[PDB]
From a paper:
10-Formyltetrahydrofolate dehydrogenase (FDH), which is composed of a small N-terminal domain (Nt-FDH) and a large C-terminal domain, is an abundant folate enzyme in the liver and converts 10-formyltetrahydrofolate (10-FTHF) to tetrahydrofolate (THF) and CO2. Nt-FDH alone possesses a hydrolase activity, which converts 10-FTHF to THF and formate in the presence of β-mercaptoethanol.
In the active site, the formyl group of the substrate is converted into the product formate during catalysis. The O1 atom of formate is directly hydrogen-bonded to OD2 of Asp142 (within 2.73 Å). The O1 atom of the formate interacts with the ND1 atom of His106 and the OD1 atom of Asp142 at distances of 3.46 and 3.19 Å, respectively. A hypothesis has been proposed in which β-mercaptoethanol is required for replacing and releasing the product from the catalytic site because of the structural similarity between β-mercaptoethanol and the product formate.
Author numbering: 1 to 308
The structure:
Amino acid sequence: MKIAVIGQSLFGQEVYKELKNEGHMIVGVFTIPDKDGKVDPLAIEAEKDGVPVFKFPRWRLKGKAITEVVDQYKAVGAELNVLPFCSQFIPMEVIDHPKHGSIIYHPSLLPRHRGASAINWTLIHGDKKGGFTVFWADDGLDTGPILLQRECDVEPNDNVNSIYKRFLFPEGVKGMVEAVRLIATGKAPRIKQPEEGATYECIQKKENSKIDWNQPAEAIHNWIRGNDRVPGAWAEIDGKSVSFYGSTLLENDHFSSNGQPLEIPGASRAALVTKNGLVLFGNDGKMLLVKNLQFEDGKMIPGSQYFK
């Protein structure tokens, strides 16, 4: 069938490629502008294939849909919109335009974790199960009826990147293809999302990913891994903002106290720079180990080398 892809990133690129190779006519690709030496991966791939590529900075202005962008969208005549990681607000005029409406990939077990940082909050809350949902867009925020869903186990030391790469990305592409297949054969369902279990969490930016040290080590570990790599959990250390990556909870080594004491403002207790990384303490006195640190200038550095 005729499909418009509205999204961005590698995931968008992969969904576009698999849908095209399934035999679907991609009539248009709607993604983000270059910024600015960098073209979005979905834009690159579609352009290679001679598919119309649109780079709208925005779809609406002062709450109202922008007519130019809506008409340009409608010109390609999609019978279905597919939205893999759309970071822009898409007007319901576009959403409802095609024959089959629009479907959206969302990396949580809806109705849990509605909102654009679902993966982060899956880990921040320490969920044991995670996964993705493909759902039909309605006017709400990730509230639309479910087409399909897929589950995976969350690992104790999963960060955003690892759960994404192990399951959410590759199984997500497969799930998007299967969903379009179900729509094409005419048997895709619409399961109204249940009320119970529904949550929303805020979008994770640098501005709101600052570490609260007054928590158990397990909560701090979850916060750090739940923002690793993006946007990066951070705290102040000796004057400057430092991001923490590659966390794991520890057991019983004592501690080995062979490490070098590192004062961290607000921390329950001074940290330890050890040969294996930065040992941090929660308010329960329990430890986590951070592998890497990054400073204001994106300079990444192993935790073990803070002083060295």
